[PDB]
Write a protein that binds this DNA or RNA. Sequence first.
RNA 1: UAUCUGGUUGAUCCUGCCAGUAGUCAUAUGCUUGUCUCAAAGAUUAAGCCAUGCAUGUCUAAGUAUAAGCAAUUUAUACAGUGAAACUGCGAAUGGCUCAUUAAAUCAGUUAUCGUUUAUUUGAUAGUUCCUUUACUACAUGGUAUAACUGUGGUAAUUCUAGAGCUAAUACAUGCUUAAAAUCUCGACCCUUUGGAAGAGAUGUAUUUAUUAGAUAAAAAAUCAAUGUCUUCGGACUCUUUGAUGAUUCAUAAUAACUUUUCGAAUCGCAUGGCCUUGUGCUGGCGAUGGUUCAUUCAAAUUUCUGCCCUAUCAACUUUCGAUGGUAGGAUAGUGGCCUACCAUGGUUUCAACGGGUAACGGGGAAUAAGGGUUCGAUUCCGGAGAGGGAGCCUGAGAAACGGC
RNA 2: UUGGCCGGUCGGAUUUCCAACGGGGCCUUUCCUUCUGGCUAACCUUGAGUCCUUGUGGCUCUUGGCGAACCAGGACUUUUACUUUGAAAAAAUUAGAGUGUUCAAAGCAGGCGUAUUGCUCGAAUAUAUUAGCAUGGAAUAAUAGAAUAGGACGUUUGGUUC
RNA 3: UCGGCACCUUACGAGAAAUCAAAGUCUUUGGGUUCUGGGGGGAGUAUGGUCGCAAGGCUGAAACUUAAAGGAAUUGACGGA
RNA 4: GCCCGUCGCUAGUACCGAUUGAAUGGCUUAGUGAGGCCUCAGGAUCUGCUUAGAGAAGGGGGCAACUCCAUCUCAGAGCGGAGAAUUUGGACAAACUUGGUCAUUUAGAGGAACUAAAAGUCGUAACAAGGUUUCCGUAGGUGAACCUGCGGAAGGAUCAU
RNA 5: GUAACUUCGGGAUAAGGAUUGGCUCUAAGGGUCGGGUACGAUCAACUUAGAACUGGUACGGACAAGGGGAAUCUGACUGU
Lengths: 155, 260
Amino acid sequence: STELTVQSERAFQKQPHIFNNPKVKTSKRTKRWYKNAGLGFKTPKTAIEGSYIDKKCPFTGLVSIRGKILTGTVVSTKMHRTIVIRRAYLHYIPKYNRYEKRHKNVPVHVSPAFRVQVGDIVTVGQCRPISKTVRFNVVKVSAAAGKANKQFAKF
Amino acid sequence: ARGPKKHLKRLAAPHHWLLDKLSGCYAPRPSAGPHKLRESLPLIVFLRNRLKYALNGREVKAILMQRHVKVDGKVRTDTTYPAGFMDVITLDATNENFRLVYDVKGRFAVHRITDEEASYKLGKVKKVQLGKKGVPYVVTHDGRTIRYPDPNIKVNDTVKIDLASGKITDFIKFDAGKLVYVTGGRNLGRIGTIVHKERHDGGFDLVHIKDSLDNTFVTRLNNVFVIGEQGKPYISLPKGKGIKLSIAEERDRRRAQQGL
RNA sequence: UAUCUGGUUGAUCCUGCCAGUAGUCAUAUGCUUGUCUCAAAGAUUAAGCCAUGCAUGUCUAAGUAUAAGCAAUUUAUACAGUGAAACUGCGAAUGGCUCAUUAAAUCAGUUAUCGUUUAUUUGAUAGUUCCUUUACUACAUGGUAUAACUGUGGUAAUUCUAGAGCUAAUACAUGCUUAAAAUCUCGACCCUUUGGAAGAGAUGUAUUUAUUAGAUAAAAAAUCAAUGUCUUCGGACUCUUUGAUGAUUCAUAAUAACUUUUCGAAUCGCAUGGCCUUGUGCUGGCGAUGGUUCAUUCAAAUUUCUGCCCUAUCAACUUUCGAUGGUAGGAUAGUGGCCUACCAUGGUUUCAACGGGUAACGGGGAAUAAGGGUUCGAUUCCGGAGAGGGAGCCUGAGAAACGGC
RNA sequence: UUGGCCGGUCGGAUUUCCAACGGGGCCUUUCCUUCUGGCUAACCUUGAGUCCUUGUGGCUCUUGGCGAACCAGGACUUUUACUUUGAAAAAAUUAGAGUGUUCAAAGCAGGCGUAUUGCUCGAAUAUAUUAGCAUGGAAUAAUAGAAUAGGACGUUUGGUUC
RNA sequence: UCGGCACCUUACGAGAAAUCAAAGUCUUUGGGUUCUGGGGGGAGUAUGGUCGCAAGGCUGAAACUUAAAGGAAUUGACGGA
RNA sequence: GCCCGUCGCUAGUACCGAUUGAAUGGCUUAGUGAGGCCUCAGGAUCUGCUUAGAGAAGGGGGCAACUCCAUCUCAGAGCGGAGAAUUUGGACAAACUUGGUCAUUUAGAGGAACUAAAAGUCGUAACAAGGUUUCCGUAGGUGAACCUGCGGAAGGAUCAU
RNA sequence: GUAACUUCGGGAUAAGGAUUGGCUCUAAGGGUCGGGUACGAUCAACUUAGAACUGGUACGGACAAGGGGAAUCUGACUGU
Ligand SMILES: [Mg+2]
Ligand SMILES: [Mg+2]
Ligand SMILES: [Mg+2]
Ligand SMILES: [Mg+2]
Ligand SMILES: [Mg+2]
Ligand SMILES: [Mg+2]
Ligand SMILES: [Mg+2]
Ligand SMILES: [Mg+2]
Ligand SMILES: [Mg+2]
Ligand SMILES: [Mg+2]
Ligand SMILES: [Mg+2]
Ligand SMILES: [Mg+2]
Ligand SMILES: [Mg+2]
Ligand SMILES: [Mg+2]
Ligand SMILES: [Mg+2]
Ligand SMILES: [Mg+2]
Ligand SMILES: [Mg+2]
Ligand SMILES: [Mg+2]
Ligand SMILES: [Mg+2]
Ligand SMILES: [Mg+2]
Ligand SMILES: [Mg+2]
Ligand SMILES: [Mg+2]
Ligand SMILES: [Mg+2]
Ligand SMILES: [Mg+2]
Ligand SMILES: [Mg+2]
Ligand SMILES: [Mg+2]
Ligand SMILES: [Mg+2]
Ligand SMILES: [Mg+2]
Ligand SMILES: [Mg+2]
Ligand SMILES: [Mg+2]
Ligand SMILES: [Mg+2]
Ligand SMILES: [Mg+2]
Ligand SMILES: [Mg+2]
Ligand SMILES: [Mg+2]
Ligand SMILES: [Mg+2]
Ligand SMILES: [Mg+2]
Ligand SMILES: [Mg+2]
Ligand SMILES: [Mg+2]
Ligand SMILES: [Mg+2]
Ligand SMILES: [Mg+2]
Ligand SMILES: [Mg+2]
Ligand SMILES: [Mg+2]
Ligand SMILES: [Mg+2]
Ligand SMILES: [Mg+2]
Ligand SMILES: [Mg+2]
Ligand SMILES: [Mg+2]
Ligand SMILES: [Mg+2]
């Protein structure tokens, strides 16, 4: 993600305390800080060789993953860098000795290292409060095929 | 609300102090100190409710303000001073030294030790950090900060503290084979060294421990205190060696030891 | 202790309710009441109103004693014992009470702080204190300014105070003495150049910014500013300090600066030893109280996940004056629409949102039940909220405190 | 693992005489995500000797020993539900062990000498369910994958960043 | 032979009985699923909403009252059978 | 025998109802807006200094190298600190007024029902083929139970040509 | 912001409540303009929104310009 229009804000977008020296022209020309978030999550190579800034990224941003790891299904991608996932679960009523389908909608920060469409299952990790409602950050996108290539037009 | 609580209701006290339900609304709230509120034993509970040397709290105060008692070498004239695990209480009259260790029912037993064993205590390393000017220190389970430790000392190890100067004499690593004393949970007060240790990145590392009668039990890593190698512990051990017999074995022993 | 019985009919068998029957750590009330143990108790109606009195004050050998207080000091003519008052410190933010508000709110179990503050306790911790050094001032120890007190008063009245005269400090405000080294910056003095040097200053710890280190799969070679220190001047130059975490721009260190420059003991008791320049010289013990930072403890704040009664005669709600998110800032102890500015159009909902009701604080629990359940929980513990109602704030570590304003 | 017979302790240690329950490996076409660097295997291959009196219940400097009996990086992982076991789980209450509160409700005490230089036992245990965490299982019930093959498998090209 | 409208006998079974091859395979109680009911009235009333031109429909209480109302069958008595 | 309704006395219960009815508790638009807090100022005082004018006072080695920290009249151009009343603009915001919307309670002339409920009056609608078989939906008519039209049912008085 | 009622069309500008000047800015909203068998000169207009500053809190500053509501009788309305 070295392209696609990073400097689109009123302020200059950069990572803090990652200095590019204009004097010393060593052949990288854009430094990029990254970390591995831990807990067995691969740092994506789009995060590695990207150019986006995203101060709430788990890899290139100032937040850390610690606490609850959840999984969920993406039901909305209409906010900027934020998604809503759906956590379906079965709740047990003892009296009838039976279950009922409940669900929770969890708003989750998504980095531009991940390309999420709706209908995808993502693994989200707990961070510090990002917004009023957001506390989780996409650490892994677990969509593979989707069963859609045999819906395209043929001869 | 509005600030720190200064009282402790009886029935909100820790159950291992064995306070009688009646005879007061209030339990002695442990002061701030080396150990926690619930992991420790106040001096009034030790001197009135264990040794029976004092009948009141006023007699505990009269004992303490004569500088007879000392905890870990220093005098501690506080009535509700939080004496906890591995703490050494020295009563000068009758020349008594005690090490606070759990009996295997989970409570602080009275364990009389010698003057050689009263010279030292053991401390589980809670963290290893650099202080300022680059000086390394370790932080033990009783709030001690010891500067310039051995660089082999890592977390969850056990140092031996000399208690005349707070210095590390020797230390025991945390690795498979070496004794474990259990200082929390429901296996509280048990002994049995090892099976292995499972890691669980993210939280709550677990230790498998198998005592001398081959009963395995799992404990969290934070409840695990190294006391030595398998055989020859660095401390003396209390009455029972941390075995946790079941209730049928307890009754089969208690019926035996009452008819001579 | 898995039980039924009476009542519809002339009689029968049912469906079905009414009635009986047994409890209630469930209230009230009637009648009666000898003993022992145990003891709930203005919750419900009125979180309605309150006369009176009390419920938070506190002094050790060890902060400050010229009480014109008492007792009658023990080289004790500075003090010395006891000590009202008052200053100072600490507490008054705990306890006790109540259940009005409150329906994802509180609460419960379970997370998190790599998102923060933390008096106290405990442990560790401070040779650097000089502005623009060649413009040092008592450290054998700095300054005034006040209570109590004395005396003159005001007001019907208050835990009201005025003017004047004194005097202290662990109050307030200042202010020094505590090596030696190295490392950097500047620098009067290198001829045919990998050619060198005294001195002068700075360097503790806080604050704030910027920048750097904070590494790491086993071995190797020739090039191009560059003899990158390749000692017989090409006998390849035998070379690695660096902690922790699952994870960090972390711990920590370094450099350049910054600051209505923070701290770095002008304190107190008891004991009075040691030595040689016998000067009351240099030293010197056990404590007390302070003090910076980091830990620790006691907490606190926010937080993750799931779980709450009845109602659709509540189906759409939120979004002007934030609703959902982005960027930046401000504010905060700190995260965060917490607020602001500029953007985008989101967020929730029949898996019941949103609205309404509750004679709803929540839980641990309680009554009863063969089992499954039903009902209750204002009330001994834990958490929350409140102190007639709202709101705002001072002080402090901690209160949006109400026996504070 | 019920025991079961030397009944020799005047109907009281035992053990392959064993059946039946319950686990762990190996082979039968049978994954154990895969290499590294530390183990140097009930030592797959046994230079050298078997003073024990016969047997198929007891051993050594070894011939580089499937360096594979768990410690940390990956050419690293279909997701669950369910169920097992366990951690971590306030006390009080509840169930329940012990104990002549004189009995009992209670309480957590107490008991025993030589009561003159005091001995000693306790204050157990269970339950505490939903949700979360760890763990074994893999029936049951969902889900995933190779069909326009952009499928799988290759220790001995290393190319637009590395 | 499959599919249908039904019928007749029996009662293995079911039911309070009438009756029923479904109204069976139910205290030996679990194939899947929707809707409805909780003694009789007040009452399909009042009120609110909604649809309809209207008549009305759909949704739909409560106060109060009551000890039975009802179902099936038996015997009797009665019938302008 | 049983039985239905109108009408009639008595009591009770709710319902409707003129009254811009009333009371209470929320939320709340707008308006005014106390108070403290932050901030812009302000400077009664209440001071430590210094003075280039008579401050009838050493320039801290010394009454010549323009080079050594040097104080009482009093007016001050030189200051410096502490600082009350007052005050500017903000955010927080009680409270009041006004209007809206929601929740709950209560008064009301009069009206229309229901129940007690068995007794009275008028009839006889239903139960028998109840004397016109009953009942359902719907429409119209009527003192009242009811009657009639249209379609339906048998729970019919027909399981049958 | 907007009630009852309604013939669902209205009632309705219901009722009620804020704002308005000047000056200096800002942001939007056009027309001509072109391609290889990652590019802007140039021209013109008045609408709307926002902001600072300013003033004896004035500002539709003269002029111009609805009073409103709850009901009853009556005729439907517009019209003559
Ligand atoms: Mg946000
Ligand atoms: Mg309290
Ligand atoms: Mg306390
Ligand atoms: Mg009947
Ligand atoms: Mg007596
Ligand atoms: Mg009351
Ligand atoms: Mg009460
Ligand atoms: Mg009190
Ligand atoms: Mg003191
Ligand atoms: Mg204190
Ligand atoms: Mg900023
Ligand atoms: Mg921010
Ligand atoms: Mg934002
Ligand atoms: Mg959402
Ligand atoms: Mg309430
Ligand atoms: Mg409760
Ligand atoms: Mg309660
Ligand atoms: Mg109440
Ligand atoms: Mg309060
Ligand atoms: Mg009151
Ligand atoms: Mg205080
Ligand atoms: Mg208050
Ligand atoms: Mg009071
Ligand atoms: Mg109070
Ligand atoms: Mg007894
Ligand atoms: Mg049957
Ligand atoms: Mg019923
Ligand atoms: Mg009914
Ligand atoms: Mg209606
Ligand atoms: Mg009948
Ligand atoms: Mg009448
Ligand atoms: Mg202030
Ligand atoms: Mg008729
Ligand atoms: Mg007729
Ligand atoms: Mg008739
Ligand atoms: Mg007739
Ligand atoms: Mg007839
Ligand atoms: Mg009629
Ligand atoms: Mg007809
Ligand atoms: Mg018909
Ligand atoms: Mg019927
Ligand atoms: Mg108007
Ligand atoms: Mg009108
Ligand atoms: Mg307005
Ligand atoms: Mg203008
Ligand atoms: Mg008229
Ligand atoms: Mg007209």
